[PDB]
Design a protein around this ligand. Structure first.
Ligand SMILES: CCCC/C=C/CCCCCCCC(=O)OC[C@@H](O)COP(=O)(O)OC[C@@H](N)C(=O)O
Lengths: 336, 217, 232, 53, 279
């Protein structure tokens, strides 16, 4: 009956307990800090061989090998220093929308409109590549997948859920609920102990892999969120949405600090990533080009225009020497 | 300049070679996307041919391989995955003719038709319309007239007229009548032409595309 | 995984022969294939190599013109045709698999061999020592010397360490002077810098006694060492 | 009312926690950014000899 | 020995310059700016645009010679090889227009027949072949007509006389027969494309996509009417220019010859502006 009241009142407390913890307006704190200026990058490599749109990519921890997934029914592995193909995995479902590369390097994963996360083993005798598990139990469509170790993996689905599995059996060890919309983005933390999800109800949520409870909920957007990434300190993240706007959220303050926007930018955002230092945030847009932002002043610092169609995926490597962008034009591009 | 690394290139070339053969082959099939009103005819249309998310149906007719994608078991935000099909050869759209009396359904079917035909991704994609269940439409006329659905309908309450009125009220919903065509068909139980019609329409589409490629449209 | 060779027996000088290697348990088509020899009381010498796709072949300067290597992939078989046999060809022949991509372990599986006997600008890898007695429990080291730096511009150092036990076939221990194969304990370690390399064995144990061999994969032809024996 | 008390039980948990002031957070951010400005090869272009691309 | 023609050349070439120029620069902006992808036929059309554009760039050296009353100013070796470039361009736009009409036939005369297999990667091969081989004739003609003698006499683009350089009178014959081969190659393709594209408009009746299949057929006939209306007058008359200048004549017949060859050549050049406009 009156249960729909205490919540509202209760919510009004939060809206006030995070307005007294706001005094600095970071854009003011970092007013004297020396700017970065302007950043020029150049296409060093171009990786050809895909016959359709590529919908995702992922780097390896060696900072040399990467994997890409396309809707031609192909998952290709590349040496980036030569442009040589190490493996080409043919899938059963051409409708793939995500990919991952295990930290060790023995496994990859894929998924999409079939509602199944398929794990593939690369380092096996017989000199082939075999599917080891087909994790099923979702009802939507796989929108992201991330490894914790070689026997654990987190998944997000368009059924308003996320899940933590156990690959040896193939059963959900935990199921994360609370969203009211298709979930579209994931980011794990450095410690691989608490992760963050970004949904189409214009919200983000911070989970806790150990228990299964949402510790904090973040709002502020005016449309669907499609991308999210963690700051390297593990104490902040960034979100990209269809309102042509990125935002930075802090966990402890439980607010947002900076918004990254521009009047002459009206397209949506498909991807987000940081730099090894956490000083320049990269973003992939639908206007066919990527942009670079100074994440302490909100100014721009550079543009990456080499693609003849949407930038769907964007990644940065753990050593910090390169960026890789993917496009619907069936091309990946390395920048330095 | 190199080493046994040479053998790592001779490999990357045996890979780049099979991707071609996979694309020089997946380009001679025809991909179709199947949509329809809520549980109207999207099922019987498949059984008319004799061969968990998306359902792929592969079949063949006169040395031409068709792949039909049925995605009704995918209840989600369609705005987020309906661009995976941009580049599909055609859209089959199945609507019924016994759905005006029932409940109102023809109106939402037309809403979906207008939401699909006039989409950013299907500005060039042709549509094959199947108006099905005409046998029963013959009976739901005598008892119930048509004006119960379309007030502005002022004409002979008969098959050869109401069917054409529905056809027109469906076909006058494409705003870009100059870039895509709409093919329409009333289904026959036996004498399986429901697939010869698809064959004709598809070959017409293919010719109309080859002629645009050759710059002498 | 399996590799069975056949086609060897007593023949006469001037004759001809054909040896066959049947594979069972792996993707024969994705693997390049080698033939290797071992004379009765001597070391290992290389013979021929054919790639995946067969669009690349290499012979030694001792058999060119009178040998021919081929492969039938549909039937998973490797062939060596030999003409004009001399007494310098009595040996045990071994069929070897090798796959090349970033991070691969070539020369990983060998066969059991065919014993043939007929009636009566290259790198030089040197293994000074030829015999070493030891006791189970202590540590050991073995040294290899090359007449040319094996390090390359890409950063890789192409040296391979093999082990042959009494009455068995060789077995890859180490590839590229630092990497350890799949199926060998951590006792074995590799080290060194161009023109000199070292293998270290700690907390020794039985079954580690036999003949150790050095190999280079920098440029064809390929070359082995004389073989360092390690017994009790 | 069928699944609305869990909403309250949750909102009673997202509110009873500490919240440092934005000043400290911005400070930690800028500090982490400074301390690691040398190993940022996208911020400080590096000698081509130390560049594998 | 004629002046009333020295006005026709200028009055025509002058407008042809600007029309071809604007058309080809717009066509390049399209094939490069708007269209970032390119099938084989777009490649061929881009090559043709480049060819006739730099031809046009070789045009304005005419009005000089003309309004200046047959000037011989710019050089003695320049204007010699300025018409060689004219011809080297006017013959690339006749082989590319013969390979276009073959791709454009093998495509339209097969839907599920799979007559042959072609891709938009082997097209750049031939497009560069026709641009390299062309130098085989360019430098050949330079070295043959330049270092083997000299004749200027305040003349350029003049009526020449053989019996001293009888090596070019044969190369020209070879080119004139190559044109007549490509002509049939083109005609028996753009006739078929209109034959097996007009019944389809009568059999496949009671059907929406029937307006097209008839515009296309009377477009694939204009694409040929244009060609033949321009290049056939030349390349046929030429037979009485190669010969009959290689032979004995008078200042009457051998003046008729020149004064008609120039008109026929301006006609053949009027096609460097009609090709961009085929939208
Ligand atoms: C295998 C074939 C490859 C295709 C490429 C070959 C391109 C050939 C370009 C060489 C010109 C062809 C001969 C020719 O006919 O041209 C002669 C002019 O070099 C005279 O120069 P002009 O004095 O200015 O001609 C004025 C007029 N009186 C006349 O002779 O035609």
């Amino acid at each position: 009956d009156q249960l729909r009241q205490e919540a509202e009142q209760l919510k009004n407390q939060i809206r006030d307990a995070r307005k007294a913890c706001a005094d600095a307006t970071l854009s003011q704190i970092t007013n004297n800090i020396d700017p970065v200026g302007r950043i020029q990058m150049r296409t060093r490599r171009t990786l050809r061989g895909h016959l359709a749109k590529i919908y995702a990519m992922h780097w390896g921890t060696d900072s040399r090998l990467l994997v890409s997934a396309s809707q031609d029914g192909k998952l290709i592995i590349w040496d980036s220093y030569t442009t040589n193909k190490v493996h080409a995995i043919p899938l059963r479902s051409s409708w793939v929308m995500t990919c991952a590369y295990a930290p060790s390097g023995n496994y990859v994963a894929c998924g999409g409109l079939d509602n199944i996360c398929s794990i593939y083993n690369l380092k096996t005798r017989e000199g082939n590549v075999r599917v080891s598990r087909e994790l099923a139990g979702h009802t939507g469509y796989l929108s992201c997948c991330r490894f914790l170790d070689d026997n654990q993996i987190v998944t997000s689905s368009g059924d308003t859920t996320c899940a933590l599995w156990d690959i040896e059996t193939g059963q959900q060890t935990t199921t994360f609920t609370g969203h009211t919309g298709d979930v579209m983005s994931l980011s794990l933390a450095p410690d691989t102990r608490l992760f963050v999800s970004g949904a189409c109800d214009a919200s983000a949520k911070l989970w806790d892999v150990r228990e299964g409870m949402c510790r904090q909920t973040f709002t502020g957007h005016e449309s669907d969120i499609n991308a999210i990434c963690f700051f390297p300190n593990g104490n902040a993240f960034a979100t990209g949405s269809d309102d042509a706007t990125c935002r930075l959220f802090d966990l402890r303050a439980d607010q947002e600090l900076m918004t990254y926007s521009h009047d002459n930018i009206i397209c949506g955002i498909t991807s987000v990533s940081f730099s090894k230092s956490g000083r320049l945030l990269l973003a992939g847009y639908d206007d066919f080009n990527c942009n670079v932002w100074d994440a302490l002043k909100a100014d721009r610092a550079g543009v990456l225009a080499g693609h003849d169609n949407r930038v769907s995926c964007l990644g940065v490597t753990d050593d910090g020497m390169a960026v890789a962008t993917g496009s619907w034009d069936s091309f990946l591009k390395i920048w330095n | 300049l190199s080493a046994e690394d040479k053998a790592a290139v001779e490999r990357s070339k045996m890979i780049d070679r099979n991707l071609r053969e996979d694309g020089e082959k997946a380009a001679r099939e025809v991909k179709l996307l199947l949509l329809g009103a809520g549980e109207s005819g999207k099922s019987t249309i498949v059984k008319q041919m004799k061969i968990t998310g998306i359902v792929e149906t592969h079949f063949t007719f006169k040395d031409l391989h068709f792949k039909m994608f049925d995605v009704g078991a995918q209840r989600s935000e369609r705005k987020k995955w309906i661009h995976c099909f941009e580049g599909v050869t055609a859209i089959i759209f199945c609507v019924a003719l016994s759905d005006y009396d029932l409940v109102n359904r023809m109106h939402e079917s037309m809403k979906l038709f207008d939401s699909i035909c006039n989409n950013k991704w299907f500005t060039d994609t042709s549509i094959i319309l199947f108006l099905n269940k005409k046998d029963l439409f013959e009976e739901k006329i005598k008892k119930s007239p048509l004006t119960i659905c379309y007030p502005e309908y002022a004409g002979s309450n008969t098959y050869e007229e109401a069917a054409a009125y529905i056809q027109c009220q469906f076909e006058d919903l494409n705003k870009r009548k100059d870039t895509k065509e709409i093919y329409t068909h009333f289904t026959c139980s036996t004498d399986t032409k429901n697939v010869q019609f698809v064959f004709d329409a598809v070959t017409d589409v293919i010719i109309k595309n080859n002629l645009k490629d050759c710059g002498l449209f | 995984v399996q590799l069975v060779e056949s086609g060897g027996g007593l023949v006469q000088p001037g004759g001809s022969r054909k040896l066959s290697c049947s594979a069972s348990g792996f993707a024969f088509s994705s693997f390049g294939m080698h033939w290797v020899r071992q004379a009765p009381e001597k070391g290992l010498e290389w013979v021929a190599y054919i790639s995946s796709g067969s669009g690349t072949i290499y012979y030694a300067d001792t058999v060119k013109g009178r040998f021919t290597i081929s492969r039938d992939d549909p039937k998973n078989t490797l062939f060596l045709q030999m003409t004009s046999l001399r007494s310098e060809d009595t040996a045990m022949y071994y069929c070897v698999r090798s796959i090349y991509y970033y991070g691969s372990s070539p020369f990983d599986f060998w066969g059991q061999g065919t014993t043939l006997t007929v009636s009566s600008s290259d790198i030089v890898m040197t293994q000074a020592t030829s015999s070493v007695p030891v006791t189970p429990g202590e540590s050991v080291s073995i040294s290899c010397r090359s007449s040319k730096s094996l390090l390359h511009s890409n950063g890789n150092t192409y040296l391979y360490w093999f082990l042959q036990r009494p009455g068995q076939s060789p077995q890859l221990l180490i590839y590229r002077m630092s990497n350890l194969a799949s199926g060998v304990p951590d006792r074995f370690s590799g080290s060194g810098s161009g023109t000199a390399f070292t293998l270290t064995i700690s907390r020794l144990e039985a079954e580690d006694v036999g003949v150790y061999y050095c190999m280079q994969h920098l440029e064809y032809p390929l070359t082995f060492g004389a073989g360092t024996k390690l017994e009790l | 009312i069928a699944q609305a008390r869990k909403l309250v039980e949750q909102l009673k948990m997202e509110a009873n926690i500490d919240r440092i002031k934005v000043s400290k957070a911005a400070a930690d951010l800028m500090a982490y950014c400074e301390a690691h400005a040398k190993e940022d090869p996208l911020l400080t272009p590096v000698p081509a000899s130390e560049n594998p691309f | 020995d004629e002046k009333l023609l020295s006005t026709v050349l200028t009055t025509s070439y002058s407008v042809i310059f600007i029309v071809g120029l604007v058309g080809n620069i717009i066509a390049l902006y399209v094939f490069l700016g708007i269209h970032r992808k390119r099938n084989s036929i777009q490649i061929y059309l881009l090559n043709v645009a480049i060819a006739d554009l730099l031809l046009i760039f070789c045009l304005p050296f005419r009005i000089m010679y003309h309004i200046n009353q047959n000037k011989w100013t710019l050089g003695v070796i320049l204007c010699k090889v300025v018409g060689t470039l004219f011809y080297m361009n006017m013959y690339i736009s006749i082989i590319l227009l013969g390979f276009i009409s073959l791709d454009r036939y093998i495509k339209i005369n097969r839907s599920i027949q799979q007559r042959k297999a072609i891709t938009t990667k082997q097209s750049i091969y031939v497009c560069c072949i026709v641009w390299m081989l062309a130098l085989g004739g360019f430098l050949t003609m330079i070295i043959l007509t330049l270092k083997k003698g000299g004749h200027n006499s305040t003349m350029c683009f003049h009526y020449r006389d053989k019996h001293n350089a009888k090596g070019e009178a044969i190369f020209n014959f070879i080119l004139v027969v190559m044109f007549w081969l490509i002509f049939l190659l083109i005609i028996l393709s753009y006739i078929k494309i209109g034959k097996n594209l007009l019944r389809i408009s009568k059999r496949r009746s009671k059907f929406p996509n029937s307006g097209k299949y008839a515009t296309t057929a009377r477009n694939s006939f204009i694409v040929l009417i244009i060609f033949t209306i321009c290049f056939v007058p030349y390349h046929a008359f030429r037979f009485i220019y190669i010969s009959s200048q290689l032979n004995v004549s008078s200042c009457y017949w051998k003046e008729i010859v020149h004064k008609t060859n120039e008109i026929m050549l301006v006609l053949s050049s009027f096609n460097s502006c009609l090709d961009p406009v085929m939208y």
